[PDB]
Amino acid sequence: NATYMEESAQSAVDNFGLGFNLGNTLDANGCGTGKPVATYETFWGQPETTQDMMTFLMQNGFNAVRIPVTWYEHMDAEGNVDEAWMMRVKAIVEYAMNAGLYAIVNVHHDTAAGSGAWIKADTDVYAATKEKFKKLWTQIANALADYDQHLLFEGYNEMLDGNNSWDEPQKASGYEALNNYAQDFVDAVRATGGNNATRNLIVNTYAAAKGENVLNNFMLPTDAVNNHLIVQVHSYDPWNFFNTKTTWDSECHNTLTEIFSALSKKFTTIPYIIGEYGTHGESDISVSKSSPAEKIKLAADQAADMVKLAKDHHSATFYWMSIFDGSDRIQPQWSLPTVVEAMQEAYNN
Numbered sequence: 001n002a003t004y005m006e007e008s009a010q011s012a013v014d015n016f017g018l019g020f021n022l023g024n025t026l027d028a029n030g031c032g033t034g035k036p037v038a039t040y041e042t043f044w045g046q047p048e049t050t051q052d053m054m055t056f057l058m059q060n061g062f063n064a065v066r067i068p069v070t071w072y073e074h075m076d077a078e079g080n081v082d083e084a085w086m087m088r089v090k091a092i093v094e095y096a097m098n099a100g101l102y103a104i105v106n107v108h109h110d111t112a113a114g115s116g117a118w119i120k121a122d123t124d125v126y127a128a129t130k131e132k133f134k135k136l137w138t139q140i141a142n143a144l145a146d147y148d149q150h151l152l153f154e155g156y157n158e159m160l161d162g163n164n165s166w167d168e169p170q171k172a173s174g175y176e177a178l179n180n181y182a183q184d185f186v187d188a189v190r191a192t193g194g195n196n197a198t199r200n201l202i203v204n205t206y207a208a209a210k211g212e213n214v215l216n217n218f219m220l221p222t223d224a225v226n227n228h229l230i231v232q233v234h235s236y237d238p239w240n241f242f243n244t245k246t247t248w249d250s251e252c253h254n255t256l257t258e259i260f261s262a263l264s265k266k267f268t269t270i271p272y273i274i275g276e277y278g279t280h281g282e283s284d285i286s287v288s289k290s291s292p293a294e295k296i297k298l299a300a301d302q303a304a305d306m307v308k309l310a311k312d313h314h315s316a317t318f319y320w321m322s323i324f325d326g327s328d329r330i331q332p333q334w335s336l337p338t339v340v341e342a343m344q345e346a347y348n349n
């Protein structure tokens with residue numbers, strides 16, 4: 001309902017500021033088809049989302065929210081999305097728009113290693129699912145068409161090959177599948193016209209990873225309009241540091257500087273974002289407000305470094321969950337105020 005005003009991908013990324021992932025929420029899945037909307041949204045222990053949560057982000061120094069959504073349990077046999085589900089995605093988008101935030105809606109655990117994932121970097125799977133994927137994106141794009149440029153679409157989350165190979169696919173043909181999905185995503189959205197003709201769209205690398213082969217074999221889709229694509233990767237590097245490091249040390253820092261240097265060396269004319277980062281490591285062990293103080297400081301230091309490096313590289317970052325989690329969301333209040341304070345200082349000073 002705010003009037004759409006076309007803005008470049010780099011402008012959006014610059015305007016994201018500090019970002020947050022509303023994780024384990026609309027992306028939660030596994031209870032089966034035909035359940036009430038709230039049964040999905042609270043299935044992994046998060047509260048139902050409220051307007052005040054989005055207001056709280058904006059009023060406390062954040063300017064963007066990523067809204068992961070898993071779709072497969074909400075699609076019928078013909079690939080039609082349940083209307084109550086699409087209306088709830090819309091409602092949460094509206095909370096973010098009302099709060100003056102940027103928002104990203106994606107296709108989340110329809111990819112990767114979970115049961116139910118059906119989008120895979122596998123040429124047979126791509127051929128079997130491409131029309132279903134384009135039909136899903138046609139529906140999302142039409143349902144969300146009228147929101148202004150603060151809303152972005154992200155085609156797919158962490159696409160893996162058929163063996164759920166993290167880091168890189170076992171066969172190079174996997175990249176052909178990923179690159180084809182990415183093109184189909186852009187094509188399907190653009191075809192719906194209107195604001196979607198120029199909306200900023202986000203395309204992710206294989207596994208949302210960032211190694212040399214994954215970047216070298218990544219092909220940005222062709223787009224008939226200029227500067228309206230963003231690349232996304234995820235970084236919880238050095239892998240498992242939360243369990244093995246006492247402090248965010250020079251090895252940790254150098255690991256991140258090398259990652260941003262590589263991404264920036266590759267993407268000299270296209271923006272990229274760090275769509276997830278956090279302390280999550282082996283067995284998804286992560287920081288919480290009852291972690292020892294030194295471990296919370298570890299989390300704070302990671303976050304401060306990530307935010308500042310991303311800013312230096314004209315990128316942007318989205319925290320995965322921990323800072324604003326579970327029961328704290330309904331108050332609303334930060335779960336990890338010292339981590340957030342380190343982020344705010346790094347971003348603003």
Ligand SMILES: OC[C@H]1O[C@@H](O)[C@H](O)[C@@H](O)[C@@H]1O[C@@H]1O[C@H](CO[C@H]2OC[C@@H](O)[C@H](O)[C@H]2O)[C@@H](O[C@@H]2O[C@H](CO[C@H]3OC[C@@H](O)[C@H](O)[C@H]3O)[C@@H](O[C@@H]3O[C@H](CO[C@H]4OC[C@@H](O)[C@H](O)[C@H]4O)[C@@H](O)[C@H](O)[C@H]3O)[C@H](O)[C@H]2O)[C@H](O)[C@H]1O
Pocket residue numbers: 158164165166167207208209210211212233234235236237239255258259
């Ligand atoms: O070789 C040692 C060391 O030498 C240095 O010189 C070098 O610089 C180091 O990079 C290297 O260490 C290893 O780094 C890799 C990742 O490196 C790539 O990305 C960072 C870049 O700087 C680098 O250039 C790139 O090459 C780490 O790889 C991690 O491995 C774990 C465990 O993987 C094993 O188990 C699963 C199986 O499928 C793998 O094939 C097998 O090796 C992976 O763990 C999985 O991660 C996902 C989440 O990943 C996503 O979120 C995190 C984000 O960083 C990532 O981009 C996303 O894809 C979880 O859901 C899975 O449950 C989990 O198993 C990591 O994803 C992967 O990065 C090595 O561990 C490290 O020793």
Ligand SMILES: [Ca+2]
Pocket residue numbers: 052
């Ligand atoms: Ca209230």
Ligand SMILES: [Ca+2]
Pocket residue numbers: none
């Ligand atoms: Ca993850």
Ligand SMILES: [Ca+2]
Pocket residue numbers: 014311314
């Ligand atoms: Ca800047």
